[PDB]
Structures are given as structure tokens and as C-alpha cells.
Amino acid sequence: SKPWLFTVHGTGQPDPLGPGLPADTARDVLDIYRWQPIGNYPAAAFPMWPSVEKGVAELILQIELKLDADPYADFAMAGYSQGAIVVGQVLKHHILPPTGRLHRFLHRLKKVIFWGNPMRQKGFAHSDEWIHPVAAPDTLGILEDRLENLEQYGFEVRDYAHDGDMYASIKEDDLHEYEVAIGRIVMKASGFIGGRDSVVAQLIELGQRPITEGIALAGAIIDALTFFARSRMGDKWPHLYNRYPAVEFLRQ
């Protein structure tokens, strides 16, 4: 029957139906897919990880709903930036594992799309046929919990990533460089100050350099992530993507 398309926006777009790469895409294939935008998802720049957890919970919930309702319906997923983390977490830890909550839907998953993916598998990337060069072969997602062995499954994946989009394309050798580590800290933190998962708690565990230096860099990274999330800039930056190859992908 009519397949389902689940979409998760990138940082800064808390409106499921609002403008943005995954929703724009869904709107270009509504003649072949049914569309379920993922809400209850703050798409927050910081703290991001709690935002990710909400998006993950909602994506899992919705998948179960639509797919239990129509057993003959296959599905696809599409996520951008923070949205790519949400889709990536659901795939890796809820669909793929032999006892994952969504594992019974694995045989029904046909296509997954990531743009600007912090969990992007090493050396796995596709061009968006645009003004930016595809991410290089020795780069991967910044996050340590990243996708692996995607080519080993029946579904097909598109992971669009530009060099210049650093968190989507870190060089393997740079993975534990200080600036990179603090970037990972910011993305995983529950908040700046608070419990075991705060930026400050993580900075202490990291060590290497004075705490004050780590606080300052974390702040500056947060100021920049916020700048991308909620600021009118041009439409030709590397963290942005042309959605059409992904459209021609969904359309098969």
C-alpha cells in the first residue's frame, strides 16, 4: 500500500510542518508517500541531547502507530542535522538490533535519508548535486555512537554530507582533538551546569586544559550553533543541502 515517510527537522525548526530540508522533501513526494512529520521535538541547539531524546521517542511512537495500522505499508525515514541523529538513533538502536523495539519492522524499511549527519558512518556519503563537494573518504560523523555496516542491510540509505560541514565530516585522525572533543561534549550534554552529564562535569572528565578554557570554547560553540539555528544568513553555506537528489531517491 501507500508507504509512510517519517521526517525529523534539523536544529532550530520545532514545527514539524514548517520549512526545512526533510519537510520540504516530503512535500515533493506526497503523491507516492504518506507523510508523518515528527513533533513533540524541540529541535533545540542547546541542550541538544535532551532534544534528541524527545525526537527519538516520538519517531519510535509514530512508526509503531502507522505501521501497525497498515501491515502492508513499507516505510522510509528522513532527518537533517539534529534530525539525522534522531533517525540514526532509531535505526541503529531500535530497528537493527535483534531485540530492538522496532526490529519487526526492519523488513519493511526501504529507504533512509540523512543530511548533515553527526552519526554518519565512516566513508559513507552521497553528493547533493549542488555547489558543495561531497565529504571526503577519510571522514565520518563526530559522534562516537555512529552508524556502521549500513551496506550490509536490505534497505537503501542516502547520507548527504559536505566537506565544510565538520560535525558530519570529521577526519578520523582528528577524532580526539580537544576542539572536537568539546564539540561532542556540547552535543551530548544535559545542560551546562548540573548533573553527571553537564558540560562542566564532562569538561572535568576530559581534563587536558584548564576548565576555564573549556568553558569558554563550549560557550562559543553554543553561540555558533545558535547562530545557525535562529539567524537569517545566506542559502549557500556548507551545512545546507540541495534536496532534489533525495527527492529522486524517494521517488525511486
Q: What contacts 73, CB < 8 A, 6 or more positions away?
A: 1, 2, 3, 4, 34, 66, 67, 108
CB-neighbour burial class of residue 80 (10 A; exposed 0-12, middle 13-18, buried 19+): buried
127 is catalytic: no
Residue 216 CA, chain-centre distance (Å), reads 26
> Is 138 a known active-site residue?
no
Q: Which is catalytic among the residues 81, 159, 162, 190?
A: 81
CATH assignment, 1-174+237-252:
3.40.50.1820
User: Which residues are CB-neighbours of 3 under 8 A, at least 6 positions away?
Assistant: 32, 33, 34, 73, 74, 75, 76, 110
Residue 185 and residue 45 in contact, taking contact as beta carbons nearer than 8 Å? no
**Domain ranges in the chain with CATH number 3.40.50.1820:** 1-174+237-252
| Max Cα-Cα span within the chain | 58
Do 81 and 240 meet the contact criterion of CB atoms below 8 Å apart? no
How distant is the alpha carbon of residue 33 from its chain centre? 21
Among residues 82, 80, 136, 74, which one has the least CA distance to residue 107? Answer: 74
The grid coordinates listed for 210 are 584548564
Q: Is 82 helix (H, G, I), strand (E, B) or coil?
A: helix
Cβ(29)–Cβ(101) below 8 Å: no
**How far, in Å, CA of 82 to CA of 196, rounded?**
22
Helix axes 178-188, 211-229, angle to 10 degrees: 60
CATH superfamily of 175-236: Lysin B, C-terminal linker domain (1.10.10.1120)
Strands (E) across the chain are located at 4-8, 34-37, 75-80, 109-115, 139-140, 156-160, 170-171
Q: How far, in Å, CA of 8 to CA of 90, rounded?
A: 11
Q: Which three cell numbers stand for residue 121?
A: 558512518
For residue 160, the cross-strand partners are 115, 126
Active site residue 239: yes
How far apart are the C-alpha atoms of 165 and 207, rounded to whole Å? 27
Angle between helices 199-206 and 178-188 (to 10 degrees): 150
Q: How far is CA 206 from CA 47, 117, 146, 210, 217, in A?
A: 19, 24, 20, 10, 13
d(CA 213, CA 71): 54
Which of 74, 159, 165, 190 is catalytic? The answer is 165
CATH 1.10.10.1120 domain range(s) in the chain: 175-236
d(CA 102, CA 158): 20
DSSP SS3 for 74:
coil
Count, residues in the chain = 252
